[PDB]
Amino acid sequence: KLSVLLTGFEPFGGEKVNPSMRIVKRLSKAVFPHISLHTLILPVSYQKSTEVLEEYYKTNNIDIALHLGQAGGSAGIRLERVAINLLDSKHPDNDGQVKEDVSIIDNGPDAYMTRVKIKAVAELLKKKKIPAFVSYTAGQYICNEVYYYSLHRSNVTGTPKHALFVHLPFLPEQVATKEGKLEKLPSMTLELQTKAVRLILENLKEFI
Amino acid sequence: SGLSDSKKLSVLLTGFEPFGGEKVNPSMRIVKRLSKAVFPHISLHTLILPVSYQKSTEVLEEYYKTNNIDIALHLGQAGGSAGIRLERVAINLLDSKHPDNDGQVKEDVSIIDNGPDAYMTRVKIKAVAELLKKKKIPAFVSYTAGQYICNEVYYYSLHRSNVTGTPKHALFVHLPFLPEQVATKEGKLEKLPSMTLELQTKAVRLILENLKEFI
Amino acid sequence: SKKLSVLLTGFEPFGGEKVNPSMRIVKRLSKAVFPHISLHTLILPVSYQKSTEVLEEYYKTNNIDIALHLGQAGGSAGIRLERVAINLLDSKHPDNDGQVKEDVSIIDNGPDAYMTRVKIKAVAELLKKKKIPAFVSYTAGQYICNEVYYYSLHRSNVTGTPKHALFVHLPFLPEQVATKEGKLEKLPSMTLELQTKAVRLILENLKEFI
Amino acid sequence: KKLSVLLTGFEPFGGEKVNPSMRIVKRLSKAVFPHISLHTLILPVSYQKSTEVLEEYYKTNNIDIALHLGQAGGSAGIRLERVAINLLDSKHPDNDGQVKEDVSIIDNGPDAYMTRVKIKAVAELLKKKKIPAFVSYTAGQYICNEVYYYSLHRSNVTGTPKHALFVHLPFLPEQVATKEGKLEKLPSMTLELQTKAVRLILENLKEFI
């Protein structure tokens, strides 16, 4: 069976929840007959995100990495095609660290594209009535960092064989607390986001 | 009256038929869902209106003549809106380049000749928004409901309320696209906001359950 | 004495900004010669109490046919012609006097709203034909800008002066976006030169709108 | 005079009568800079011919820096592109009517290149001169990205050009003024300000390489 590592991130930036973590916790209680599902919550940390992830790859054989992250302001399931070799944000991570114009892997390639059939994923989700679309920038923060890490490791070691990053809307509860014009941000219920990630897992063979 | 503060509120909940190429309308679906009016403090009426400049208010007026209504809670689709959009203002104007479902186009037409330029709801609209947010539902107050059929019905009810006393109150609630309506969109429109039917229904349910605190 | 008497107003900077496009346009056009109208100019404070006081004193002392009020609408991308003024003060943000108003009428038992009687769609069409992005808006907010607009349309209804009022919301100047951090660095703007031309075009064509 | 600079724009496309990139290049094609030898070139909006025309110019001329301009309708500021990806992909035809879906630009070329120009310093200079400007990490998958990827790939394998940077541009106000429906509210930037932005980049080029 396919070995799948499904990851999410802890809350950050003053949020009390992270949709990626809530989805991972919900799906950790789910049995899929065609895959062996590993789950892992990563820290929002430039240093520790990839240390934790590398330690998991070292101790477990993973065929496919499915990384989830929060993309506040996005309105649909945001499938990321591109990971770039750069850390860059004015905002600190959860360790208080700030990175500006820093490579992830010195003399690594400038970027990787996923080898997953990402448009087929978007099409499957839309046919199941879930808003979904392909994005070409996953940012330059921890989410992109973990994505680039997995695609680079996949390129150099062959493990994981594939990696895909799925950015997620705010949960409605995260927007309900927002002040000013941010009270009008998009959201998607946890039930629908969970269904979307479940559909990806149930149909994984069609995408690799 | 002689009833003092003990009468059951009669509530008219309306939605609209699909329009603009959509096969569904979230307002119509919520009204159908809430059709099973298990509410302890209200007598719930429901009505689906046509998206038609002429017939929308005729059908609505026909219902107002044949039933007694205390509060009109009008629901409508606001494609592109991300949260429960509580409308505070109805204006005396029909104006859109888009035809209604009968093929009529209205441009800069008064709704009620020599009616006021606009009405604001007298419902405690900020308290509705605050209740929904506290229940973890995105919601906000809007000051334009457009100049299409939704605004028209809103103005009609607030004007009829001012001159006749019936209904006593009116509120219009604009609603996001359902996720299935965005899932079919082309190009950049695939990125529009949506809200599940379950959450939209919960929002309208909460307004109905807490109506006393808003009027 | 007999040309069209026009009052053009703008507002002082507010909200941490050091400039306001409305003020800059009024300053530029106060220096211009308009041969076919009598142009009055006035910079108003961003103050719930003092904005309409200063405005009222000008109306008391000068006969004004049309009031053309300008204001900043940070985030808007074109010339934003306001059709509706509503009888409400409501914002979490203080004015420049530190005063906050939530859910209060402007005029006790005034109408809920006024629409301009200016031919506002014709204004939008003229600007577009002159290659200037412009559109009609149905909410001018509930802050000082809307307050002044409602004040003028109410005064016009109750006293007859001014005969007309129109409110024009304006994009940020590019220098106001150039200072912004985070995602606000991507906000729309319009140069002072183009904003000034738009307002000049409205003033030059006023006969066609009233 | 020292740096050989190729400034490019694109022809109108998608139903427009103008392209801001083309107008800027025409306006600047007479401009003399004491530190630069300025080449100008208008490229077709064509998957096939854009890089053919560009390759022919590189083959016959010694270019140090390519500064590519393009239209990004809907963008509000000077949009400095950091990333070119190895992909042609759009629902929309080019001006020759061809459609490309998930086609590599360079077979087994790298998935993407980032510019080696000091792009954050370019953004900071523009902002200090009171011009809205920001760094973008996707230039699309149409002709603009195609030309960008071509130049960065050519730079990596041949050394010519030494550097390339792509600058996406807002609509001109005249392009939004013709728009119907909700598109009448799109952002724009006058030709005068866009031209000043590109002029400032050229004037300060040594700061960025």
* Contact between chains at A188 and B179 (C-beta distance less than 8 A): yes
Alpha helices in D44-97 (DSSP H): 49-60
Which residues in chain C have Cβ-Cβ distances shorter than 8 Å to D130? 174-175, 178
- Residues in A whose CB is inside 8 Å of some CB of C read 90, 179-180
* Contact between chains at C187 and D76 (C-beta distance less than 8 A): yes
Which residues in chain A have Cβ-Cβ distances shorter than 8 Å to B133? 176-177, 183
Cα gap D99→D90, rounded to integer Å? 7
Paired tokens of C111: 């109408």
Confirm if B175 and B117 have CB atoms less than 8 A apart: no
- Residues in A whose CB is inside 8 Å of some CB of D read 82, 84-86, 101, 109-113, 119, 135-137, 139-140
Give the orientation angle of helix C192-204 with respect to helix C120-129, to 10 degrees: 130
Identify the CATH number of the domain in which residue D140 sits: 3.40.630.20
Chains that touch C (3 or more CB pairs under 8 A): A, B, D
- Specify the resolution in Å: 1.9
The number of distinct structural domains making up chain A is 1
Cα gap C70→C80, rounded to integer Å? 10
Nearest partner of C62 among C34, C45, C38, C32, judged by Cα: C38
Nearest partner of A77 among A142, A127, A126, A117, judged by Cα: A126
What string of DSSP letters covers A150-203? HHHHHHHH--SSEEEEEEEPPPHHHHHT--GGGGG--B--HHHHHHHHHHHHHT
Of A109, A135, A137, the CB nearest to D111: A109
Residue B101 CB neighbour total at 10 angstroms: 17
D68-107 residues labelled b (16+ CB within 10 A) or e (exposed): bbbbbbebbbbbbbbbbbbbbbbeeebbeeeebeeeebee
Q: What residues contact B155, with CB distance under 8 A and at least 6 apart?
A: B90, B91, B92, B111, B112, B115, B118, B119
Q: What residues contact D52, with CB distance under 8 A and at least 6 apart?
A: none
Angle at B52 between CA B51 and CA B54, to 5 degrees: 150
Q: What residues contact B95, with CB distance under 8 A and at least 6 apart?
A: B106, B107, B108, B109, B147
* Contact between chains at B116 and C115 (C-beta distance less than 8 A): no
CA–CA distances in Å: residue B70 to residues B1, B64, B203: 14, 10, 20
Cα gap D175→D162, rounded to integer Å? 34
DSSP strands (E only) in A60-114:
64-70, 77-80, 82-84, 111-113
Is A206 marked active-site? no
Q: What residues contact C75, with CB distance under 8 A and at least 6 apart?
A: C171, C172, C187, C188
Q: Are strands B42-49 and A111-113 parallel, antiparallel or unpaired?
A: unpaired
* Contact between chains at B118 and C86 (C-beta distance less than 8 A): yes
Sheet holding D3-10, edge to edge: D36-43, D3-10, D65-71, D163-169, D78-81, D133-136
Chains that touch A (3 or more CB pairs under 8 A): B, C, D
* Dihedral angle computed from the Cα positions of residues B129, B130, B136 and B139, in that order, rounded to the nearest 10 degrees: 20
Q: What residues contact A162, with CB distance under 8 A and at least 6 apart?
A: A63, A64, A65, A114, A115, A116, A154, A208
What string of DSSP letters covers chain C? --SEEEEEEEE---TT-S--HHHHHHHHHHTS--TTEEEEEEEEPS-TTHHHHHHHHHHHHS--SEEEEEEE-TT--SEEEE-EEES-B--SS--TTS----SB-SSTT--SEEE--S-HHHHHHHHHHTT--EEEES---SSHHHHHHHHHHHHHHHH--SSEEEEEEEPPPHHHHHT--GGGGG--B--HHHHHHHHHHHHHTGGGT-
CA–CA distances in Å: residue C82 to residues B86, C85, D93, D124: 21, 8, 39, 35
DSSP strands (E only) in B131-168:
139-142
Residue D151, classified by CB atoms within 10 Å of its CB into exposed (0-12), middle (13-18) or buried (19+), is buried
Mutation site, D111, D124, D148, D152, interface A, largest A CB count within 10 A: D111
Nearest CA in chain D to B96: D181
CA–CA distances in Å: residue D83 to residues A136, C82, D116, D139, D158: 10, 41, 10, 7, 19
Of B108, B120, B143, the CB nearest to C121: B108
Nearest partner of A37 among A189, A159, A200, judged by Cα: A200
Maximum separation of any 2 CA atoms in chain C, in Å: 52
Confirm if C126 and C31 have CB atoms less than 8 A apart: no
Number of helical H runs and strand E runs in chain B:
6, 10
Cis peptide before A131 (omega within 30 of 0): no
- Taking the CA of residue A117 as centre, how many other CA atoms within 13 Å lie in the half-sphere pointing to its CB? 12
Of A127, A176, A191, the CB nearest to B136: A176
Cα gap C106→C103, rounded to integer Å? 10
Is A10 marked active-site? no
* Contact between chains at C135 and D184 (C-beta distance less than 8 A): yes
CA–CA distances in Å: residue B192 to residues A17, A196, B176, B185: 23, 17, 9, 9
Q: Are strands A162-168 and D133-136 parallel, antiparallel or unpaired?
A: unpaired
Cα gap B204→C10, rounded to integer Å? 42
Residue at B27: amino acid letter:
S
Is A143 marked active-site? yes
Paired tokens of D121: 């310093």
What values do phi and psi take at A129, rounded to 5? 70, 30
Cα gap C89→D151, rounded to integer Å? 56
Q: What residues contact C195, with CB distance under 8 A and at least 6 apart?
A: C21, C25, C79, C170, C171, C173
Q: SS3 for D157-198, per residue?
A: HHCCCCEEEEEEECCCHHHHHCCCHHHHHCCECCHHHHHHHH
Cα gap C92→C15, rounded to integer Å? 12
Confirm if C125 and C204 have CB atoms less than 8 A apart: no
CA–CA distances in Å: residue B79 to residues A169, B53, B191: 18, 19, 12
Nearest CA in chain B to A73: B193
> Looking at C82, C147, C154, C164, which residue is catalytic?
C82
Which secondary structure element, helix H or strand E, spans residue D126, and what is its range? Answer: helix D119-128
Which residues in chain B have Cβ-Cβ distances shorter than 8 Å to A185? 82, 138
Q: What residues contact C20, with CB distance under 8 A and at least 6 apart?
A: C10, C11, C12, C13, C14, C72
Range of the domain at D153: 3-208
- Residues in D whose CB is inside 8 Å of some CB of B read 91, 180-181
Nearest partner of B155 among B63, B79, B53, judged by Cα: B53
Nearest partner of A185 among D76, B80, B78, judged by Cα: B80
Residue B125, classified by CB atoms within 10 Å of its CB into exposed (0-12), middle (13-18) or buried (19+), is buried
Cα gap B182→D58, rounded to integer Å? 45
C49 strand-pairing partners: none
Confirm if C82 and C178 have CB atoms less than 8 A apart: no
Cα gap B172→B177, rounded to integer Å? 16
